[model samples]
Target: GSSGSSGPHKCEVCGKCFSRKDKLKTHMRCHTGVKPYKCKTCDYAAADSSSLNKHLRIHSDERPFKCQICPYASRNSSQLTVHLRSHTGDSGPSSG
Candidate 1:
């Protein structure tokens, strides 16, 4: 039976819902600490393929996210977003 054909399937452990059973199965590995995707460059292992792909970027000199205002580059979008905040004088939280 198609899990997606009926409705959203909920994870029994964390209550996260997925449109497909395979997605739910893959998400369960997060809670179970089951990393099936292993990196070839390092000992880092990820539960999902996307995470493994992200980890692979760390091994290469490729910085996909580049700062427009400065000569800074990042492997991820979140890092570029944070770098942009610095250019805008937004230093985030005040550690006082």
Candidate 2:
């Protein structure tokens, strides 16, 4: 019962399982070095649409994710996730 649900899918290089064949090919883009997604305004290349979307944030200067703990905001949600790690009870008097 240990990770047997996705054992059907195997990787050529990493041996990690993906949800579907389409996503399997999606992750394989990294192992195979096949970056098809490109930035029109810059020379940045990404492996998928999600990556290109993050890269586009640099050109547009958009911060969709806001931090509730402070005045910090980020264009990438993952960045905010890591940024939130520092607010773990370190700032006192947050009862307001």
Candidate 3:
């Protein structure tokens, strides 16, 4: 679903879906700046579910995206897409 003009929606930020009202309320904890989940391997903490999911990949050795012309790799696809621009000589939005 879209953010619906009420500012960024919690579901859009956390990428979690819920059916019942109680479930949605519980899931909103991810966006309330209360991190119930923490990584023991590092001092990293996440405010939301999606951030936690991406952070766990650090310990999971899950680099699913890689640059074709370089050794660069990323656990998340969006990061890899950004890295690929360097290889393709794409200056991108901030390069100017």
lDDT per residue as tens, model 1, 2-60 = 65646667885667768888888788777765578888767677877999878877675
Per-residue lDDT tens digits of candidate 3, residues 1-96? 776553333376657755566777777765564576677577567777678777877675767777767756788999877776676574456844
For all predicted structures, in order, the TM-scores are 0.29, 0.31, 0.28
Error of 1 at 17 (Å): 64
Best-performing candidate as measured by TM-score? 2
Worst 10 residues of 3 by lDDT: 5-14
Best by lDDT: 2
TM-score leaderboard ranking: 2, 1, 3
> Which window of ten consecutive residues has the lowest lDDT sum in model 1?
1-10
lDDT at residue 3 of model 1 (Cα atoms): 54
> In terms of TM-score, which candidate is stronger, 1 or 3?
1
